[PDB]
């Protein structure tokens, strides 16, 4: 299962990124990996492909379950008994810089007079806030 899906999963995410249910199903796959195989197989580039594609997927959907699943996958990936941890944690830190910058826009827009609480800004803040809550549930920020 590991050897197969390390090759196949990024292509699947690329294929069906628009569909929330399919990615939500697929995200349960990494919870069962033997994580040694990323090291012994010499396959870290496919891991990089996985994190890039999953990043794009996170950026395109807002249904809560996918965010829960992706966060849990990163929790499994940031297991500190395996050598791989540091790379994914750094990329995660880049994601959290992205999230905080959007948060900075959110706090500045609401605090100022701005556009007088227009619905569109509220929707942007709400979507970003949902992503922050979902990631923050599993990880110390």
């Amino acid at each position: 299962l590991t050897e197969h899906f390390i090759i196949t999963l990024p292509m699947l995410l690329s294929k069906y990124s628009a569909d929330a249910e399919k990615v939500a199903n697929l995200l349960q796959i990494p919870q069962y990996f033997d994580l040694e195989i990323y090291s012994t197989g010499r396959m870290e580039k496919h891991l990089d492909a996985l994190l890039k594609q999953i990043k794009f997927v996170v950026e395109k959907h807002v249904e809560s379950d996918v965010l829960e699943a992706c966060s849990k996958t990163y929790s499994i990936l940031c297991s500190e008994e395996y050598t791989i941890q540091n790379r994914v944690d750094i990329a995660r830190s880049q994601l959290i810089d992205e999230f905080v910058d959007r948060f900075n826009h959110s706090v500045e827009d609401l605090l100022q007079e701005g556009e007088e609480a227009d619905d569109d800004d509220i929707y942007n803040v709400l979507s970003t806030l949902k992503r922050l809550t979902s990631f923050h549930n599993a990880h110390d920020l």
């Binding site: 010499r42 396959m43 580039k45 496919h46």
Partner: protein, 187 residues
Amino acid sequence: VTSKMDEIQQLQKALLDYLDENTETDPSLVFSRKFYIAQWFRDTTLETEKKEIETTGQIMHRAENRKKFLRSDTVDYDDACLIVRYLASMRPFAQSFDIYLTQILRVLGENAIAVRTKAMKCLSEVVAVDPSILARLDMQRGVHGRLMDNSTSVREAAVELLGRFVLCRPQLAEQYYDMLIERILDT
């Protein structure tokens, strides 16, 4: 026994594209690429040595090699396995086993006991891998000679060979049975 049963340059090109993709996948493949390049280069020169017809052929060959090295689709894994198996099966290694056999038969007449014993034992292993090799007449006369040899060690080795060979192939064993069952009284 488990494997066998200008286009060559195009195959070289194809393998180069396979490895080239794998460079992206995984480092250290560049070394293999350069190594294969050098090996093709030396093999074309060595066949050149054996002329002007093949001189012009090899100068386009070698110039294309230089160009293609400077040049650093859709072909995948199993394809690469079969191509490189073929190109290896062209190389002067797959047709070496035969030669090796000949060498072994030089050993059987020697003036040291242990070496002949071990040679016979390894041959017994060889035949018990590939049972259709008791056909060449020289090996036949060899095992007969060693069956009559004057030292108990090689004698037991030879009879073990003949017995295991008889056991493996069920039929066609009544031709060695007589020469086998003669040997019980061997002191």
